[PDB]
Design a protein around this ligand. Structure first.
Ligand SMILES: CCCCCCCCCCCCCCCCCC(=O)O[C@H](COC(=O)CCCCCCCCCCCCCCC)COP(=O)(O)OCC[N+](C)(C)C
Ligand SMILES: CCCCCCCCCCCCCCCCCC(=O)O[C@H](COC(=O)CCCCCCCCCCCCCCC)COP(=O)(O)OCC[N+](C)(C)C
Ligand SMILES: C/C(=C\Cc1c(C)c(O)c2ccccc2c1O)CCC[C@H](C)CCC[C@H](C)CCCC(C)C
Ligand SMILES: *[C@@H]1O[C@H](CO)[C@@H](O[C@@H]2O[C@H](CO)[C@@H](O)[C@H](O)[C@H]2NC(C)=O)[C@H](O)[C@H]1NC(C)=O
Ligand SMILES: *[C@@H]1O[C@H](CO)[C@@H](O[C@@H]2O[C@H](CO)[C@@H](O)[C@H](O)[C@H]2NC(C)=O)[C@H](O)[C@H]1NC(C)=O
Ligand SMILES: CC(=O)N[C@@H]1[C@@H](O)[C@H](O)[C@@H](CO)O[C@H]1O
Ligand SMILES: *[C@@H]1O[C@H](CO)[C@@H](O)[C@H](O)[C@H]1NC(C)=O
Ligand SMILES: *[C@@H]1O[C@H](CO)[C@@H](O)[C@H](O)[C@H]1NC(C)=O
Lengths: 70, 698
């Protein structure tokens, strides 16, 4: 439980979980749950943000160091 | 004169000796089609750099100071700082522009080639067939004399203006496209493609609507989607070469590429293939097209006069002079053509040498041309770590310190991830760890099953490229026919119940924790022998075929396999909390409908007043049920409004978004080039510029 990296035993051991899907949405649209590998890397349709890269650990601090207080 | 000579374009006697082969492979040929293809390829790569190569998103992928686990082919390769990466992409853009305009063609091709392969080899997760094809085409075009017609370098140099080129420039490109089509076709001669499992659900797209007038969906998903693709791959391989079958081949191939562009999000690959299709036509089609225009257009379009002699071709001398002896560049061209085509044929089937990369599929993805042949789906991923000092056991967030998710399917990427975690965890108070992985995955709708041994420490595991990995679980092809029966079980359920099918090896066991929400969960055994243990009271029951058990909700349980063969079972569960919330929401909706239509004359409860008002102002905070109802109603209205949108608005938004991407890429590149050249200013100025760069166009 020391940071975002670690998880508890309970959350790690839930096999029967509702999966958020790399392609399209679990909520709607065809073929979300099957994986086509060749298509380009993009995720659930939302506001004009292309990728999940901003969800990485420590993104805000590194971005502030490099490009200042945006 | 001979029919074989006319059909194939060369006589048998031309192949009798090496010298005649060199002469055949360096005969004069018109340059026009090659020039048109060079222009189109340059334009498409220029459009592709700011979109798929990731220049717009590169500020959030190679950010300095961030700790990320990379996946390069060679561990020696490492990214440069962000600014030098933007300089590299700038050099790529300049090379692409030079190739498009044909200005300093060889330097432009080199400047596009070296950075492209540097970026390609740096990350294995961004590999795919249509990037490998672009790399190969850039490699081929570096040597070809594609700047002899409709090129700025022709205007700056008389000797290279509308000149002949050797035949092998066309031969290599035609061979590449033929190899792509034929290898893709043969790779799709698989049990999962000819039977209707891969791409089973793509028949529901509205583009296939006319086919449904004459065929059912089940046949439409087999005859048209699957068999049609194979037949078109082989035929488009063969038809385009011969003059008789070129028109029908062009029509079918254009239709095929347009549909692939609309159905998928592959990118510029469909347009590149469309631009490569005309090369099987005669070499001189742009010239006759230019001839068939009014004089006013001819004053602007390229030259129509016959091409002049060149020096990079072997000219047969009919003046009685002895034939021109081939020099060195001609022999090198012939050898390059033969060896390159042989290597291109060999490489897709080179998976028996690099066995370290082999998996349930064959080798790394990108250079096999097996497009849309295998579809995978993952259920669970558990990463356990044991500390080397205290002995504590803990669990990691599955997608930690990573940006892609192909590491769940390849042993080598798993080993790199394990080493990265080993180096990084000591920053988080963890000594020399031992890391274990447990990943469940199913390919083409089979039983979900482990892919790596969950009892092997990946940090200290053994891996070499040219030896088979000893901790990759085999794929059970003996359980394939069950995919029939399972589908029937998928159709026997209500709108709420859900099913998950599991197959497990002997000796191994699965520990699971049913959450409190998933009440009324059951486990049924399909084949083999298992024992289900509840740890709350330490009670284990052995289940035989066709037996069902009601598992606890909110407690741990374990399933052990105790048969000589793998055991297959199934979890069938229903989410009780969602059901109760849905019933309550339906009751509330019924009450508001009674209020609106005049019924329920009595005063409404206070908790219902926010629903009619629709706004929380000057009153108590709403209950969670009211908030959920209002959120659902607002979401439904938003979706309904989105559906009712005219086409022109969607087109305008698409154009504005693309313009935003291009503008952001250009501004970020300019900022970093200024940083490199004139140095880095204060933080406030950097923040101001970055805020300006991200602004929406409006
Ligand atoms: C001692 C050593 C002896 C020699 C050993 C090595 C022998 C190697 C032989 C194989 C290589 C031969 C290369 C020949 C190059 C050649 O002919 O190039 C081209 C052919 O183009 C190619 O490079 C073809 C690429 C492969 C495409 C698929 C071909 C399908 C063939 C089907 C079976 C027949 C000649 O074209 P052209 O402009 O004259 O037009 C002719 C065809 N029409 C008019 C219909 C469009
Ligand atoms: C001889 C000819 C032989 C035949 C050749 C035929 C092929 C030639 C191709 C040449 C290239 C044509 C353009 C290609 C465009 C293209 O690829 O389109 C796009 C990519 O290209 C673009 O969008 C380019 C946009 C450039 C920016 C244009 C901005 C124009 C602004 C106009 C002014 C606006 C003013 C507004 C204020 C008044 C594909 O998008 P995607 O892959 O994201 O697809 C999204 C949807 N799915 C995933 C479903 C597919
Ligand atoms: C998605 C499909 C194949 C994968 C693919 C892709 C995406 C490519 O970009 C390829 C480019 C070059 C070579 C092979 C490629 C490839 O394999 C099948 C798509 C099938 C399509 C939707 C069916 C309609 C067209 C058929 C052939 C019409 C036939 C009509 C019959 C009555 C004869
Ligand atoms: C618990 O879930 C089971 C499935 O795990 C459901 O059982 C269904 O119950 C109805 C009762 O009328 C039968 O018609 C269906 O055939 C049953 N489904 C099966 C066997 O898959 C049910 O939703 C839940 N039952 C209880 C008692 O909570
Ligand atoms: C219930 O039965 C299972 C069936 O295997 C038991 O699992 C074994 O447990 C012992 C220790 O109790 C281990 O040494 C064995 O290796 C386990 N077997 C396998 C195949 O892994 C389980 O222990 C039993 N539980 C109780 C409480 O009696
Ligand atoms: C209880 C409820 O109404 N909605 C839940 C939400 O609270 C929770 O955060 C989410 C987790 O998947 O699932 C949904
Ligand atoms: C444990 O890690 C925390 C969080 O990173 C850090 O503040 C601290 O220095 C570490 N504690 C010890 C006792 O090493
Ligand atoms: C079950 O339904 C509840 C309804 O609130 C939802 O939050 C949850 O994500 C679902 N899944 C599980 C595993 O509880």
């Amino acid at each position: 439980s020391k940071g975002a990296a670690f998880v508890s035993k309970q959350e790690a051991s839930e096999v029967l979980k509702r999966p958020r899907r790399y392609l399209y949405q679990w909520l709607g649209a065809p073929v979300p749950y099957p994986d086509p590998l060749e298509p380009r890397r993009e995720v659930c349709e939302l506001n004009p943000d292309c990728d999940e890269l901003a969800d990485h650990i420590g993104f805000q601090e590194a971005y502030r160091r490099f490009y200042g207080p945006v | 004169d001979s029919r074989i000579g006319k059909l194939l374009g060369f006589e048998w006697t031309d192949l009798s000796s090496w010298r005649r082969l060199v002469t055949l492979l360096n005969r004069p040929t018109d340059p026009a089609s090659l020039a048109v293809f060079r222009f189109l390829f340059g334009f498409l790569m220029v459009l592709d750099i700011p979109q798929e190569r990731g220049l717009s998103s590169l500020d959030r992928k190679y950010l300095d100071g961030l700790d990320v686990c990379r996946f390069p082919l060679l561990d020696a390769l490492r990214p440069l700082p962000l600014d030098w990466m933007y300089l590299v992409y700038t050099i790529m853009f300049l090379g692409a522009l030079g190739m498009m305009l044909g200005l300093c063609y060889r330097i432009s091709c080199v400047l596009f080639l070296l950075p492209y392969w540097y970026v390609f080899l740096l990350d294995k997760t961004s590999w795919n067939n249509h990037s490998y094809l672009y790399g190969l085409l850039a490699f081929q075009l570096t040597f070809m004399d594609a700047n002899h017609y409709w090129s700025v370098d022709g205007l700056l140099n008389a000797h290279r203006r509308n000149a002949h080129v050797p035949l092998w420039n066309y031969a290599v490109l035609r061979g590449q496209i033929f190899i792509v089509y034929f290898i893709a076709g043969v790779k799709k001669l698989d049990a999962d493609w000819v039977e209707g499992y891969s791409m089973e659900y793509l028949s529901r797209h509205w583009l296939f609507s006319p086919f449904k007038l004459l065929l059912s969906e089940e046949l439409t998903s087999l005859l048209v989607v699957h068999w049609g693709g194979l037949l078109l791959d082989l035929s488009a391989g063969f038809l385009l070469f011969f003059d008789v079958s070129r028109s029908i081949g062009l029509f079918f191939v254009s239709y095929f590429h347009c549909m692939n562009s609309q159905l998928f999000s592959i990118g510029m690959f469909s347009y590149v293939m469309l631009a490569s299709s005309p090369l099987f036509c005669s070499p001189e089609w742009p010239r006759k097209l230019v001839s068939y225009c009014p004089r006013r257009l001819q004053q602007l379009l390229p030259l129509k006069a016959a091409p002049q002699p060149s020096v990079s071709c072997v000219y047969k001398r009919s003046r009685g002079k002895s034939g021109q002896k081939p020099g060195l560049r001609h022999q090198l061209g012939a050898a390059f053509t033969l060896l390159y085509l042989l290597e291109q044929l060999f490489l897709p089937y080179s998976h028996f040498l690099t066995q370290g990369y082999n998996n349930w599929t064959n080798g790394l993805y990108g250079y096999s041309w097996d497009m849309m042949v295998h579809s995978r789906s993952h259920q669970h991923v558990k990463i356990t770590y044991r500390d080397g000092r205290t002995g504590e056991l803990g669990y990691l967030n599955p997608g930690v310190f990573t940006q892609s998710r192909r590491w769940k399917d390849h042993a080598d990427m798993l080993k790199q991830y394990a080493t990265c975690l080993s180096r990084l965890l000591p920053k988080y108070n963890v000594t020399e760890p031992q890391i274990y992985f447990d990943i469940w995955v199913s390919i083409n709708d089979r039983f979900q099953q482990r892919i790596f041994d969950p009892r092997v420490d990946i940090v200290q595991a053994a891996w070499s490229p040219f030896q088979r990995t000893s901790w990759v679980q085999p794929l059970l092809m003996d359980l394939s026919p069950w995919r029939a029966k399972l589908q029937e079980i998928k159709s026997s359920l209500d709108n709420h119940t859900e099913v998950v099918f599991i197959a497990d090896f002997p000796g191994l066991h699965l520990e699971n924790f049913v959450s409190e929400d998933l009440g009324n969960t059951s486990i049924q055994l399909l084949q083999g022998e298992v024992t289900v243990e509840l740890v709350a009271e330490q009670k284990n029951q052995t289940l035989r075929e066709g037996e069902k058990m009601q598992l606890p909700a909110g407690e741990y349980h374990k399933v052990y396999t105790t048969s000589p063969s793998p055991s297959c079972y199934m979890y069938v569960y229903v989410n009780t909390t969602e059901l109760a919330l849905e019933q309550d929401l339906a009751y509330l909706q019924e009450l508001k409908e009674k209020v609106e239509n005049g019924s329920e004359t009595g005063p409404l409860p206070p908790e219902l007043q926010p629903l009619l008002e629709g706004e929380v102002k000057g009153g108590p905070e709403p209950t969670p049920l009211v908030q959920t109802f209002l959120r659902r109603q607002q979401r439904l209205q938003e979706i309904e409004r989105r559906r009712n949108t005219p086409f022109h608005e969607r087109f305008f938004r698409f154009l504005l978004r693309k313009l935003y991407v291009f503008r952001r890429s250009f501004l970020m590149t300019c900022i970093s080039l200024r940083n490199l050249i004139l140095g880095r200013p204060s933080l406030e100025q950097l923040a101001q510029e970055v805020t300006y760069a991200n602004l929406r166009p409006f």
